Write a protein that holds these residues in place. Structure first.
Motif, PDB file in Angstrom:
ATOM      1  N   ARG A   2      -6.013  14.839  -6.445  1.00  0.00           N
ATOM      2  CA  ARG A   2      -5.189  13.698  -6.827  1.00  0.00           C
ATOM      3  C   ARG A   2      -4.037  13.515  -5.854  1.00  0.00           C
ATOM      4  N   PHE A   5      -5.105  12.786  -2.014  1.00  0.00           N
ATOM      5  CA  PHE A   5      -5.755  11.504  -1.808  1.00  0.00           C
ATOM      6  C   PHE A   5      -4.793  10.363  -2.108  1.00  0.00           C
ATOM      7  N   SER A   6      -3.968  10.522  -3.147  1.00  0.00           N
ATOM      8  CA  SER A   6      -3.017   9.483  -3.517  1.00  0.00           C
ATOM      9  C   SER A   6      -1.967   9.287  -2.434  1.00  0.00           C
ATOM     10  N   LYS A   9      -3.548   7.462   0.494  1.00  0.00           N
ATOM     11  CA  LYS A   9      -3.773   6.041   0.270  1.00  0.00           C
ATOM     12  C   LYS A   9      -2.463   5.271   0.153  1.00  0.00           C
ATOM     13  N   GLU A  12      -1.429   4.728   3.683  1.00  0.00           N
ATOM     14  CA  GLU A  12      -2.275   3.692   4.270  1.00  0.00           C
ATOM     15  C   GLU A  12      -1.872   2.304   3.779  1.00  0.00           C
ATOM     16  N   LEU A  13      -1.545   2.184   2.491  1.00  0.00           N
ATOM     17  CA  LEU A  13      -1.135   0.897   1.940  1.00  0.00           C
ATOM     18  C   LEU A  13       0.201   0.445   2.515  1.00  0.00           C
ATOM     19  N   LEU A  16      -0.532  -0.954   5.802  1.00  0.00           N
ATOM     20  CA  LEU A  16      -1.116  -2.288   5.707  1.00  0.00           C
ATOM     21  C   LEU A  16      -0.060  -3.339   5.379  1.00  0.00           C
ATOM     22  N   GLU A  19       1.962  -4.030   8.431  1.00  0.00           N
ATOM     23  CA  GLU A  19       1.153  -4.835   9.337  1.00  0.00           C
ATOM     24  C   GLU A  19       1.137  -6.297   8.911  1.00  0.00           C
ATOM     25  N   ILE A  20       0.991  -6.548   7.610  1.00  0.00           N
ATOM     26  CA  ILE A  20       0.934  -7.924   7.122  1.00  0.00           C
ATOM     27  C   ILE A  20       2.268  -8.631   7.341  1.00  0.00           C
TER      28      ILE A  20
ATOM     29  N   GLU B  19      -9.653  10.818 -14.329  1.00  0.00           N
ATOM     30  CA  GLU B  19      -8.554  10.109 -13.672  1.00  0.00           C
ATOM     31  C   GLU B  19      -8.572  10.311 -12.163  1.00  0.00           C
ATOM     32  N   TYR B  20      -9.026  11.466 -11.678  1.00  0.00           N
ATOM     33  CA  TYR B  20      -9.123  11.657 -10.237  1.00  0.00           C
ATOM     34  C   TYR B  20     -10.073  10.642  -9.631  1.00  0.00           C
ATOM     35  N   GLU B  23      -8.434   7.043  -9.928  1.00  0.00           N
ATOM     36  CA  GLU B  23      -7.370   6.823  -8.957  1.00  0.00           C
ATOM     37  C   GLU B  23      -7.925   6.743  -7.544  1.00  0.00           C
ATOM     38  N   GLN B  24      -8.878   7.613  -7.209  1.00  0.00           N
ATOM     39  CA  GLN B  24      -9.465   7.583  -5.877  1.00  0.00           C
ATOM     40  C   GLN B  24     -10.110   6.231  -5.597  1.00  0.00           C
ATOM     41  N   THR B  27      -7.396   3.311  -5.502  1.00  0.00           N
ATOM     42  CA  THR B  27      -6.530   3.284  -4.332  1.00  0.00           C
ATOM     43  C   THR B  27      -7.311   2.977  -3.060  1.00  0.00           C
ATOM     44  N   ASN B  28      -8.575   3.403  -2.970  1.00  0.00           N
ATOM     45  CA  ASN B  28      -9.409   2.926  -1.870  1.00  0.00           C
ATOM     46  C   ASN B  28      -9.581   1.413  -1.929  1.00  0.00           C
ATOM     47  N   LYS B  30      -7.505  -0.718  -3.228  1.00  0.00           N
ATOM     48  CA  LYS B  30      -6.226  -1.293  -2.826  1.00  0.00           C
ATOM     49  C   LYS B  30      -6.032  -1.245  -1.317  1.00  0.00           C
ATOM     50  N   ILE B  31      -6.438  -0.154  -0.667  1.00  0.00           N
ATOM     51  CA  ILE B  31      -6.350  -0.096   0.790  1.00  0.00           C
ATOM     52  C   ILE B  31      -7.224  -1.177   1.413  1.00  0.00           C
ATOM     53  N   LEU B  34      -5.496  -4.546   0.885  1.00  0.00           N
ATOM     54  CA  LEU B  34      -4.375  -4.713   1.803  1.00  0.00           C
ATOM     55  C   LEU B  34      -4.863  -5.027   3.210  1.00  0.00           C
ATOM     56  N   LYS B  35      -5.929  -4.354   3.649  1.00  0.00           N
ATOM     57  CA  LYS B  35      -6.496  -4.658   4.958  1.00  0.00           C
ATOM     58  C   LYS B  35      -7.011  -6.092   5.014  1.00  0.00           C
ATOM     59  N   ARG B  37      -5.970  -8.639   3.165  1.00  0.00           N
ATOM     60  CA  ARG B  37      -4.811  -9.525   3.152  1.00  0.00           C
ATOM     61  C   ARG B  37      -4.161  -9.595   4.526  1.00  0.00           C
TER      62      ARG B  37
END
Lengths: 48, 53
Positions: A2, A5-6, A9, A12-13, A16, A19-20, B19-20, B23-24, B27-28, B30-31, B34-35, B37
């Motif tokens: 958790r 990875f969180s 991400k 990474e967000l 992004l 960048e925007i 939940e892992y 969330e994984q 959030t992927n 969401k990434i 965002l890319k 957008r």
């Protein structure tokens, strides 16, 4: 898993989003630069 | 006592894995969004600037 990875991400967000924002800034900057190019061309040609 | 805590611990493991995964995936997604957008904002920026050119 958790936490690793969180954070991956979220960073990474943030990348992004920055960048925007810079992309919109580039939109407006190119607008200004190209309008200035047009004005310079027109004024030089007018003086010619 | 140990068996009961083991049961609760097992259920905590099960939920937390749920939940892992959630969330994984989220959030992927969401990434990716965002890319995309950023992609569209670059598209509008560049097209409008091209027409300014």
């Amino acid at each position: 898993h958790r936490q690793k990875f969180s954070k991956e991400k979220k960073e990474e967000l943030e990348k992004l989003k920055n960048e925007i924002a810079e992309v919109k800034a580039e939109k407006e900057k190119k607008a200004s630069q190209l309008k200035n190019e047009l004005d310079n061309r027109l004024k030089q040609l007018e003086r010619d | 006592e140990l068996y009961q805590e083991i049961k609760k611990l097992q259920f905590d493991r099960n939920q937390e894995n749920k939940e892992y995964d959630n969330e994984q995936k989220d959030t992927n997604l969401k990434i990716q969004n965002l890319k995309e957008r950023l992609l569209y904002k670059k598209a509008r920026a560049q097209l409008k600037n091209q027409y300014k050119e």
